[PDB]
Structures are given as C-alpha cells and as structure tokens.
From TrEMBL:
Highest taxon of the lineage: Viruses
Intracellular or extracellular location(s): Virion membrane
Protein name in UniProt: clade A/E 93TH057 HIV-1 gp120 core
Entry annotated with the keyword Endoplasmic reticulum: no
Lineage, uppermost ranks: Viruses, Riboviria, Pararnavirae, Artverviricota, Revtraviricetes
Positions annotated as glycosylated: 46, 119, 126, 147, 161, 174, 180, 195, 216, 246, 252, 259, 296, 309
Organism (species): Human immunodeficiency virus type 1 (HIV-1)
A single cellular component GO annotation: viral envelope
Amino acid sequence: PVWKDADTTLFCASDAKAYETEVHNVWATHACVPTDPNPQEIHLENVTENFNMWKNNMVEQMHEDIISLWDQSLQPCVKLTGGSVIKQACPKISFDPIPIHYCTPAGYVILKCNDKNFNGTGPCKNVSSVQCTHGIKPVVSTQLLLNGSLAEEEIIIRSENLTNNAKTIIVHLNKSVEINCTRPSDIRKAYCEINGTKWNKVLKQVTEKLKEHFNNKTIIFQPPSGGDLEITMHTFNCRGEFFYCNTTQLFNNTCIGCNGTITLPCKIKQIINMWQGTGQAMYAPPIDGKINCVSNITGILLTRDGGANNTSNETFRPGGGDMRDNWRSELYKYKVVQIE
Ligand SMILES: NCCNC(=O)N1CCC[C@H](C(=O)Nc2ccc(Cl)c(F)c2)C1
Ligand SMILES: *[C@@H]1O[C@H](CO)[C@@H](O)[C@H](O)[C@H]1NC(C)=O
Ligand SMILES: *[C@@H]1O[C@H](CO)[C@@H](O)[C@H](O)[C@H]1NC(C)=O
Ligand SMILES: *[C@@H]1O[C@H](CO)[C@@H](O)[C@H](O)[C@H]1NC(C)=O
Ligand SMILES: *[C@@H]1O[C@H](CO)[C@@H](O)[C@H](O)[C@H]1NC(C)=O
Ligand SMILES: *[C@@H]1O[C@H](CO)[C@@H](O)[C@H](O)[C@H]1NC(C)=O
Ligand SMILES: *[C@@H]1O[C@H](CO)[C@@H](O)[C@H](O)[C@H]1NC(C)=O
Ligand SMILES: *[C@@H]1O[C@H](CO)[C@@H](O)[C@H](O)[C@H]1NC(C)=O
Ligand SMILES: *[C@@H]1O[C@H](CO)[C@@H](O)[C@H](O)[C@H]1NC(C)=O
Ligand SMILES: *[C@@H]1O[C@H](CO)[C@@H](O)[C@H](O)[C@H]1NC(C)=O
Ligand SMILES: *[C@@H]1O[C@H](CO)[C@@H](O)[C@H](O)[C@H]1NC(C)=O
C-alpha cells in the first residue's frame, strides 16, 4: 500500500431510524447511508505518518454538514439575516444528536493515529487504516466540549500554536465529568449541577499540564471578559432549547468549603446569535414540564491572555464560537489520503 496527502469529498453514515421524527435522524435518513455493517481496521506495520488536525479538510467538510442540518431542522419563528427578514412557523421539534461516520469514496482511505498521547500535530508511530471514522456526535457547544471522546492516557493539550495567544487551545480530558442541566416543572430559569469534587480534581490536573507546556509558570483561570452571550456563557442545545449557563464557579482558581455540588445558573433564550455567523434567530417558548439533559464534559475550549511575556503568570479563559474546533476535537486523529 502507498498513499499521498489529498482532499476529496466525503460521504456520511449513521444508525438513523427512519421512523423517528427527531431531526438528526430525519436528516441522516436522507443525507447519509447506513453504517458499515462489517467495519475493519487494519494496522500499518512499521509506518510513521505525520498528522495536522489544524490542517484537515475533514473538519470543514463536517462543518458544512452541521450547517446544513441546522438550517433544515430548526424551525424559527422569524429568521433575521443580513439586512433580511423572514417570518415562518416555529413548532417544537425533537432534538437529540446521533453519531455520524465520515467515509472516503473509492481511491481514498482514512488514516487513524493510535498513539495514545498524540497531541494532534506531528508524527504518529501507530497508524491504522479505516474506511470510515467512528460515530461522532455533532454537539454544538461553547466553553465546554460535551458528549465526546476521552483521551485514553493523560490529559492532552492541543493547539496549532501555543505561543500565539490568538490560537484556540483544546484540552482533551481523560475522565468525563457529568453536567446535569434541568429546567424544572420563570419558565426560562434553569440550572446545571456538577460534582465539585470530580470537577476540581480534573481541573487541578489540567493546570499541572499547562504548567508543563508553559515553563512551570503560574496558571490562572478567568471568566471571559466581553463578547456575545454565547461566548461568555456555556451555551448548548438541550432537547431543542438553547441553554445559556454561567460557568464562573467552574473557573474558580481557589477551590484548587467547596467540594459538594456546583450549581450553575442558566437561562433558556428564545433569541440567539447563530453559530453559523449569519445573524439573529427567534424561536418559541420552552415546552412545559421537566427539561433535563445529563452530558459528559470531555474537553475544554480555552484562550490564553496576551501581554504576559514579562510577567510570571499565564491566564486562560473559556473560549468558543468557532464550532470547527468542536469537530476538530474529534477528527484530530484522522486524515484523508489518496492511494497511489
Ligand atoms: N472564535 C470564533 C468567534 N465566534 C463568533 O464570532 N460567533 C458569532 C456570535 C456567537 C456564535 C455562537 O457561538 N452561537 C451559538 C448558538 C447556539 C449554541 Cl447552542 C452555541 F453553543 C453557540 C459564534
Ligand atoms: C496501537 O494501537 C492499538 C489500537 O489503539 C493498540 O492495540 C495499541 O495501543 C497499539 N498496538 C501496537 C501493536 O502498537
Ligand atoms: C505536539 O507535538 C509536536 C511534536 O510532534 C510538537 O512540535 C508540538 O509543539 C506539540 N504541541 C503541543 C501543543 O504540545
Ligand atoms: C459518559 O462517560 C462514560 C465514561 O466516562 C461513558 O461510559 C458514557 O457512555 C458517557 N455518556 C455519554 C452520553 O456519552
Ligand atoms: C489523567 O491524566 C493525568 C495527567 O495529565 C494523570 O495524572 C491522571 O492519572 C489521568 N487519569 C486517568 C483516569 O487516566
Ligand atoms: C506561533 O505564534 C507566535 C506568536 O504569535 C509566532 O511568533 C510564531 O512564529 C508562530 N509559530 C508558528 C510555527 O507558526
Ligand atoms: C439531575 O438533576 C435532577 C434535578 O437536579 C435530578 O432529579 C436527577 O436525578 C439528576 N440526574 C442525575 C443522573 O444525576
Ligand atoms: C463526586 O464524586 C465523588 C468521587 O470523586 C463521589 O464519591 C461522589 O458521589 C460525588 N459527589 C457528588 C455530590 O456528586
Ligand atoms: C518544571 O517544574 C518541575 C517540577 O516538578 C521540574 O521537575 C522541572 O525541572 C521544571 N522545568 C522547568 C523547565 O522549569
Ligand atoms: C456570572 O455570575 C457572576 C456572579 O456569580 C456575575 O458577576 C457575572 O456577571 C455572570 N456572567 C455573566 C456573563 O453575566
Ligand atoms: C449527551 O448525551 C446524553 C445521552 O445520549 C443526552 O441525554 C444529552 O442530552 C446529551 N447532551 C447534549 C448537550 O446533547
């Protein structure tokens, strides 16, 4: 086998149920084929292959699909786009993301990096060959990566360029921390409950590894100062409702009487600034009854402060906004090649 680096158009696969009215299922039913009934991963003996997750067309290809999925699935009362106005009907929908596999057409194959502490760029010593990735959930998230994969060994610090502060940092956790968000039976007041013990343990480890990457320096956490509500809050979609949660308690540099349950204040918003960058959208009020989503915190989005080269500290705040990094967090060990 001999290959070369190449971009090409991918296709998708799913376990989607054709009887479901859930929108991820309805979209995967007509845009994707069924998942590979006999998937086989094959090792590449004595092969070293270098990867670059910040340099992967797979990401932008998935991004186009999630844009597609949201525009056909989400029914907004009125669509406020670039100097435009549209008025429609906005019934409530069934919303729950399902895993999606990304697969190469003929002449192309996917290379899988299996080195347990691969950071996302550079040489991979344990390389695989697959026809499709594994099932990736398209979770649209800010500040915190939800329902993803875990790093198998240590916590991984991923970044295209650690010395550039504009570059986003992806923290790949090795132990998931549960986030339990509930709007109980304001109709827009909600809260997310987190294990403080579990949470502070893991964030202590996150700081000890950023210490390794930044020359033993003091690692400070801080809430985002300024930006849109989707940036300064942990924003996610639970069962169709847009949750905005205040995470200041999570990035508490201190509980590093504070090892119980952390309860984050949340509000469901009807008017959101779309992650697709095209403007404002207005949706309908929340459904009646108890609205609950439990998810796994599996990764953290961070931006580092600048102007601290002559200081003794480094400051990191929760990031968000560019959903590409969310897909990048799960496609990092994949790249497409052209077989020669
Ligand atoms: N480093 C990139 C700067 N990002 C940026 O400029 N954006 C434009 C304005 C806010 C946009 C957004 O994140 N929207 C959103 C909507 C719903 C959910 Cl659930 C969610 F998690 C997020 C992103
Ligand atoms: C390579 O990765 C595989 C799959 O993750 C795993 O069995 C092990 O870590 C590695 N195996 C060899 C033979 O290097
Ligand atoms: C990732 O590993 C490569 C070596 O392959 C190194 O050059 C790069 O600085 C590392 N990046 C991070 C963020 O650790
Ligand atoms: C949450 O994480 C555990 C392991 O940490 C895993 O077994 C479980 O399936 C995860 N749940 C979801 C919804 O991903
Ligand atoms: C997670 O990684 C840290 C180092 O980053 C390590 O100390 C810890 O033991 C790991 N935890 C698990 C459950 O692997
Ligand atoms: C990373 O960013 C720093 C500061 O922005 C810059 O000086 C450096 O050349 C960049 N390195 C690479 C490899 O792009
Ligand atoms: C999530 O929280 C609600 C109320 O806060 C509680 O009733 C439920 O048992 C919790 N679920 C889990 C899995 O912790
Ligand atoms: C937090 O996790 C610990 C283990 O780290 C566990 O014993 C305990 O049940 C959890 N506490 C809460 C309040 O969820
Ligand atoms: C960083 O601190 C650790 C503390 O365990 C020490 O072992 C290491 O030599 C230090 N390295 C640098 C570059 O300061
Ligand atoms: C989050 O809560 C703190 C107090 O707990 C408050 O000062 C801060 O303004 C809140 N964040 C936002 C974005 O409103
Ligand atoms: C994460 O997965 C669980 C189980 O599938 C689900 O209940 C929860 O709503 C998911 N979280 C998000 C943010 O989609």
